[PDB]
Amino acid sequence: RKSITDLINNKERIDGRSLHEFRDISIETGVISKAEGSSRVKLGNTQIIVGVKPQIGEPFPDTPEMGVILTNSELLPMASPTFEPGPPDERSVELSRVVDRCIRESRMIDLEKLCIIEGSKVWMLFLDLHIIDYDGNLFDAAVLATVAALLDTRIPAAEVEDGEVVINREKMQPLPVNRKALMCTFAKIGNEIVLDPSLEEEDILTARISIGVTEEGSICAMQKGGEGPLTRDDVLKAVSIAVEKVPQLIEYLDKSMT
Amino acid sequence: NNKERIDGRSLHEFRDISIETGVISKAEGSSRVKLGNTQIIVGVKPQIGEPFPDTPEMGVILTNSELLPMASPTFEPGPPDERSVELSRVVDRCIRESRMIDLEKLCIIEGSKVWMLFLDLHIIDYDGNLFDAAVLATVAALLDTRIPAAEVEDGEVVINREKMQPLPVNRKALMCTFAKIGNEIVLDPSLEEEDILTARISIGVTEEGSICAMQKGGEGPLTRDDVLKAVSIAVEKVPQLIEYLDKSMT
Amino acid sequence: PEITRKSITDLINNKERIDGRSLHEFRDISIETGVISKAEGSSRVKLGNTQIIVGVKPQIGEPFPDTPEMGVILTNSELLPMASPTFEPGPPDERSVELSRVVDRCIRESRMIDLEKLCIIEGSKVWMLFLDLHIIDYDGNLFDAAVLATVAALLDTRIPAAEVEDGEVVINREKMQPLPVNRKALMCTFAKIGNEIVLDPSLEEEDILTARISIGVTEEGSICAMQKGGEGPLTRDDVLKAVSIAVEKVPQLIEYLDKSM
Amino acid sequence: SVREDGRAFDELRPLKIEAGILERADGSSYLEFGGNKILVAVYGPREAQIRKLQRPDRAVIRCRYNMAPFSVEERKRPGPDRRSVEISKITAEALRPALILEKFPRSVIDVFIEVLEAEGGTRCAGITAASVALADAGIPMRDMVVACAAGKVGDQVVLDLSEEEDKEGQADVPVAILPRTREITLLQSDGNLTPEEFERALDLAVEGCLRIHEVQKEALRK
Amino acid sequence: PSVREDGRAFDELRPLKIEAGILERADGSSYLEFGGNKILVAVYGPREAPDRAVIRCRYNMAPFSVEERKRPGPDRRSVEISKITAEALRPALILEKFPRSVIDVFIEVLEAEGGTRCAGITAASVALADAGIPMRDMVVACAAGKVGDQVVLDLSEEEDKEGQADVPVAILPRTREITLLQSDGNLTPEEFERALDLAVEGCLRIHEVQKEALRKR
Amino acid sequence: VREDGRAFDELRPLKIEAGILERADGSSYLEFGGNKILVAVYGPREAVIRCRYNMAPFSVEERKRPGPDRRSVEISKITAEALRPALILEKFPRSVIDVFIEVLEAEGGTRCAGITAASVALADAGIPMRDMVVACAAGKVGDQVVLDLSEEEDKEGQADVPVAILPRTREITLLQSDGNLTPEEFERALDLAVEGCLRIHEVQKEALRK
C-alpha cells in the first residue's frame, strides 16, 4: 500500500489512468421489462441497477401540490464481502441520501406536474438503487443510473374523472424533467485529488468529496466523506473539475439513450 | 429401520392421536391436538378488514405459527424463524389449495369489507412431526369455528352476536409426513427419527383423493420411487384420518 | 468480596447514610418548567444529580374503539446511553418499560387529567397527550424524579382550543388552554437496605439494596400506584411503613411543586 | 353483598393445578383459574447461550410471560408488548428468592409462561404455576412462591378479582409471597385505595396465597 | 395432444441463457435468463464462521422485479425459498473437504416471471462451480404444472395466471436424485407422476445449458 | 436586515457550558438560537469513535417518534468522521470512545452545533486532542449568501453549506451543500462559514477555561 501512495504524488494511477479520468462507462436503459423506467450502469466494474416504480398515494400534508420521490438503495451482500445483509446500514443510507439530494435539489423533476388531485392523490416515484457489484465509487455510478432510469421512465396518464382517479395505460407518458444533473466523486490520496476512485484507492484515501453539478454549471449537492480532512484548495479544485466534467458525462449519457 | 420401529410401530403407522375442540372459550374456533407427545393448540380468530386488491370478493386467511421455546430447547424466542415459516406456509398451502373454505362466502361488502380468519398455531410440545399435527389441528379448529352473522345495511357492516354461523367448509384435507431412513420411508416420524432422517416428505390429500400440497424437506435426497410410494400411502391413509377426525367431533 | 454491601448496610442499620441524610429524607430538588420552547408543556427536574426532562406533545387522532369519549395519554421514556454507562441504546429495555409504565400508572390511576374533556368528536377525534420522559443523568431513583417531572410538565402544558365546525376539527391557536387537571399525585420510592427502608435512594444505595418500593399517593392521601422492585423480599412491616412515610411526605412534595411554579 | 358470579368477598375462583404435563420441558405445570388457562415450562439449569446474562456467583432466572394470540377477546398480534415485558421483569424477581441458586454459577434457568386464555389475574396465576414447574424441574428451592390478587369493586375490598371485576373495579393489588416466611416477593397496586383499605387487601391476598399454596403442594405430591 | 398459445409443445422449455463469471467481487457467479426471468447469483466462500459445514443461502427479490413495487426486506415466501434452496444445493457439494465453514449463496431476482425458485437453484449450481467449490454433481431445477386441463412444462405468465398446479423439482442429474420437490393446486396421483417425470426431463435438458456455461471458463 | 434582524455575517446567540453532567466522563451544553444540545462523552473504554446523534421526541414542532431515522444515521456517520482528526487516538489501542449528542430542541444547524458541543465534551473528558473541532453553517436566502441560517430561514433557503474545521490548520473535516449555488457563490459561503467557525472556537476555548 506504501507503493500505491508514492505512485499517486506523481500524476500516475495503478490502472494507467490520468488523475482526472473516469473509468470506462456503460449505460443501458429498459433493462427490467416490468419496471416503468430502469437502467444498468457499469463504471469500471462497479455495477448498479436502478428501477423507477410509480405509485399513487397521498402527498406530504404541507405540500398538497407536490409529487413524491422516494430514494432507497440496497447495498447487496452480492456486491461485496463487506456488505452485511439486513436493513440499510450507515453506508447505504448515506449513498441513498446523497443521490436523493442530487436529484431533488437540481429540481430535475417537476413534482408539481406529478400532482393528480391536490391534497389527496399524487404520483410517488420509488427510485430503487440495486448495487450488484462494488469496485469503487458508488456515488457517481448511482447518480448516473438514477438519472438514466428517470429519463427512461414512462408512466400512465392519470385523469381526474368526476373526482376519482383513472389510470389510462393507453397513453404512456415520460416524466416532466426540467434539467439533468450528475455527480463527480474525488478521493484525496497523498497531496492529490483523484477523480473516480477504484476499490484499491477507496481503501487508502484520506478523504473523499462528491459534487453534484447541474446543466448550467451550478452546484446542487456536495458530500465530504472519509476520516481524514480536506483543505480549502482541495475542495475548490474539486469543484473546478466537476463543473468541467459533468457536461461531458451529460453528453455521454444523452448519446447512450439514442 | 428395515421392518419395524423403536416404539413398536411399523413403517406406515401413526402414533396415538388425540383431538379436542372448543378448548379456548374466548376463541371463535379452537382445537388441541396430540400426536404422540407432539402437542399443538390452534385458535381461529375472525376479524373484519379490507380484501386484497386483486380479490375484492374473497375473504382472507392468515396462517401463523409460534414455535415456542416451551415446545423444545432448540426453539429460539423472537419472531418466526425458517423452521416456523415453513411449517406455517405448508399448513397454509394445504388449507388454501384444497379450497376447504369458500372465501367468496366470507365477503361482506365487495371491495371493502370481508372476514379475515386468523389461523394461529401454538406449538406447545415438540416430539416429532409438526406438519401432520398442525394440519390436523387447523382443520379441526376450522370445523369448530362459529362466527357472527355479518349483515349489510345502507353502507357499513353490522355484526349480529346472536346468529353464530359455522365457516363455509367445502371439503376437508389432511396431511401425511414421511421420513426417509435407510432405504425406507416411515410415516409420522418421532423426534428420535427426525434427528437422523435423510429427508422427509409431507403430502396433503383431499377427500376425493387428490394431492393439494407437497413438501420435500431435509438435507438429503429422495428417489422417484420414494416419492411415488409416499403418495400412494398418503392417498390411502388420509381418508382414515378424515374419518377419525369426524368421529372425534360428534 | 461483598464489602461495599456490608459497609453501606452497617451504616444504614445504625441510622445514617453516606451523604449524611435522615433515613426518610429526599435529596435537594430542582424543578423548572417551560424548558423546551417548541413543546406545549415541558419540565426539567433534578433530584440530587438525577436529571429528567419531560415534554408534553398534544396531537389529534382516533380514540380507542371501546373508549370513544376519552382522550389518550401515551407515556414513553428514553433511558439514554447519555444518562448512564449501563444504559444500552436501541428501543426501550425492561428497565425503561417498567419506569415508563409505573409513571403512566401514577398519572392515569390518580385520574389527574379528565380525559373526557380531551374528547373532540366522540369515537373519532380526541386529544392525544404524548408524555415523553428524557433521562439525561442517572444518579439514583428514576421513579420519583420521573413522576415529579411528568406532573410538572402536565401543569405547564397549554394546548390550542379545538372547536367543532362542519364536521372537521378546527384548531384555534388564539385561545391557549391549560389541561383539565382534576388533582395531583406524586411518588415516593424506598429502598430496603439492611433492616431499614430508606427514602429516595442514591446510585450507591441502588447498587446494594435488597428490594425497593415505589408508592404513588394523591392529594387526599389515597394510594394510586405501587411497585415492588428488586431481587430480594419485603416484609409486611416494610410495606406498611413505606405507605406511612409516603402518605406524610407527598403533601410536602406537592406544595414544593406548587411553589416552584 | 354478592359479587356478580356469586362468590363471597374472600372467595377464590375455581383452581386446578397439574405438574409434569409437558414432555420436552425439564419441569412443567398447567393451571386453570376461572377462565384462565396457563402453561409453564422450565428449562435448566443450562449453559448461557447469550453472552450478556451471566453472573460469576450464581445462576439467572430468565423469564418470558407470553400471551397466545387467541388468549383474549380480540386477536393479540403475537410478539412482545410493554405489559408483557413488565410482567416478565417482576416475575423473574418474584421467583428468585425461592431458588437456591448459588448452586449453579455462570448459568440459566428459563421460565416460559404461556397464557392460552386470560381472565384477569394472570401475572399471579403465572407465578403460582411457575413455582410448581420450577419444583417439577428439580430446581433446589428453599420454599414455594405463590401469588394471588386482591382488589376493590363494589366499594368492597374483595379477593381474587375476575376479569369482569377488573373493568368497573376500583383497585387491583397483586401479591406474591414465600409461604413459610410470609416474605412479599411481588407487590403492585393501581386504582384508588386508602392506606387502611390497602392494608386489608394486602392481608386478604396473603390469605389467598396460603390457600393456593395447598393446591401447589398437592399437585407436586402426586 | 394440445398446443399452447405461444407455440410451445406441452413438454417444451422456453429459451434459457446461462452465463458464468459475470461478477467481479463474488468468488463465483452466474446470470440466468428464462422467459421474463432475470436472475443473478453470487457465491462467497468457503469462509470463516458450530457443528457442521453449513451453506447459507438468501433468495431476494429486487423491489422492481415485479409488477407492483415490493418493499425491500425479507418476507415469508422469500424465507421459505431460501430454506429449501439451501437444502436443494447441499447434496451436490463435497463439504467434507472443509467440514466447519460456511458458503454464502446470494440469489438476486432482478425480474420475475414465475418459476424463479427453480431458476434460482439452476443458476446457483453454476455459481457454486464457478467459485471452485468441490462438487460431486450439478444441481438443476425446473417446474412442471397443469393449465388447460393439461400438465405442461415451464409455465408461461399468461398460463400461470390460470394455473391449476405447480410442481417445482430440483435434481442431481447423474443419479436423478430429487433434491427439491413441491406441489400445490390439484393433481391426481397419476397426474402428479406425469408432472414430476416431465419436470425431471426439463432438468436434464437445462443441465446441458449449465455444463456449457462452464466450458466458457 | 434579515427576518430576525441580523446582519449577513451574524451568528445567533451562543452559549456553551462544560462539565454539566454527572455520569458522563465529559459533557457540554450548547444554546444557539432556539437550539438546545446536550453532549455526553464516554471512554476510552473496552481506537474507534462511536457517535449517536439523536433528537428528543419534543425537540421539534411535531412529535418525532423516538428511534433512529435516516437523517439521524447520516449525521451520526459524518460527525464521527468530523471529530476523528482532532483526536490523538494512537494513545489508546484497541478501545472505543462514545459521543452521545442529544438534541433537546432544534432550530436549524444542529449537525454543526452538535459537533461544536461535542469537541468541548471530548476535551472535558480528558481525551487527548491535537486541536478543537468546530462547525458552523453558511447558506443563501434573500438571493444573498448569509452566515448561520436559522430554522425558518432554511424554510425558504436557496442553499445550505455546513462546514466543520480544525481551527489551527483550517482543515475541512465536514462539508455538505444542497440547494443551488454557483461555484463563485459556494466559494463565498464556505469562506463565510469558516469565519464563523473561528469565532465560535473562541466560545469553545472559553467554556473550557471557565
Curated annotation (Swiss-Prot), chain A:
GO biological process, one term: rRNA catabolic process
One protein family per Pfam: RNase_PH_C
UniProt-annotated location(s): Cytoplasm
Chain segments annotated as coiled-coil in the UniProt record: none
UniProt keyword list: Cytoplasm, Exosome
Keyword Glycosyltransferase: no
CDD domains named among the record's database cross-references: RNase_PH_archRRP42 (cd11365)
Record's keyword annotation contains Cytoplasm: yes
An annotated GO cellular component: cytoplasmic exosome (RNase complex)
Superkingdom of the organism of origin: Archaea
Disulphide bond pairs: none
Cited HAMAP family: Exosome_Rrp42 (MF_00622)
Function in brief: Non-catalytic component of the exosome, which is a complex involved in RNA degradation. Contributes to the structuring of the Rrp41 active site.
Membership in a protein family: Belongs to the RNase PH family. Rrp42 subfamily.
Assembly notes: Component of the archaeal exosome complex. Forms a hexameric ring-like arrangement composed of 3 Rrp41-Rrp42 heterodimers. The hexameric ring associates with a trimer of Rrp4 and/or Csl4 subunits.
NCBIfam families: PRK04282.1-1
Protein name per its UniProtKB record: Exosome complex component Rrp42
Organism listed in the record: Methanothermobacter thermautotrophicus (strain ATCC 29096 / DSM 1053 / JCM 10044 / NBRC 100330 / Delta H)
Gene name linked to the record: rrp42
UniProtKB/Swiss-Prot annotation, chain B:
Keyword DNA-binding: no
Keywords associated with the record: Cytoplasm, Exosome
GO molecular function: mRNA 3'-UTR AU-rich region binding
SUPFAM superfamilies assigned to the protein according to its UniProt record, in alphabetical order: Ribonuclease PH domain 2-like, Ribosomal protein S5 domain 2-like
Subcellular location: Cytoplasm
One GO CC term, this protein: cytoplasmic exosome (RNase complex)
CDD domains: RNase_PH_archRRP42
Predominant location category: cytoplasm
One GO biological process term: rRNA catabolic process
Entry coiled-coil feature ranges: none
HAMAP family xrefs: Exosome_Rrp42 (MF_00622)
Family, as annotated: Belongs to the RNase PH family. Rrp42 subfamily.
Quaternary context: Component of the archaeal exosome complex. Forms a hexameric ring-like arrangement composed of 3 Rrp41-Rrp42 heterodimers. The hexameric ring associates with a trimer of Rrp4 and/or Csl4 subunits.
Role description: Non-catalytic component of the exosome, which is a complex involved in RNA degradation. Contributes to the structuring of the Rrp41 active site.
Record protein name field: Exosome complex component Rrp42
Organism: Methanothermobacter thermautotrophicus (strain ATCC 29096 / DSM 1053 / JCM 10044 / NBRC 100330 / Delta H) (Methanobacterium thermoautotrophicum)
From Swiss-Prot, chain F:
Enzyme Commission (EC) number: 3.1.13.-
GO molecular function, one term: RNA binding
GO-annotated biological processes: gene expression; rRNA catabolic process
Localisation per UniProt entry: Cytoplasm
UniProt keywords, alphabetically: Cytoplasm, Exonuclease, Exosome, Hydrolase, Nuclease
GO CC, any one term: cytoplasmic exosome (RNase complex)
Keyword Methyltransferase: no
Broad enzyme group: hydrolase
SUPFAM superfamilies in the cross-refs: Ribonuclease PH domain 2-like, Ribosomal protein S5 domain 2-like
Superkingdom to which the source organism belongs: Archaea
Subunit structure: Component of the archaeal exosome complex. Forms a hexameric ring-like arrangement composed of 3 Rrp41-Rrp42 heterodimers. The hexameric ring associates with a trimer of Rrp4 and/or Csl4 subunits.
Function recorded in the entry: Catalytic component of the exosome, which is a complex involved in RNA degradation. Has 3'->5' exoribonuclease activity. Can also synthesize heteromeric RNA-tails.
Protein name: Exosome complex component Rrp41
Gene source species: Methanothermobacter thermautotrophicus (strain ATCC 29096 / DSM 1053 / JCM 10044 / NBRC 100330 / Delta H)
Taxonomic placement: Archaea, Methanobacteriati, Methanobacteriota, Methanomada group, Methanobacteria
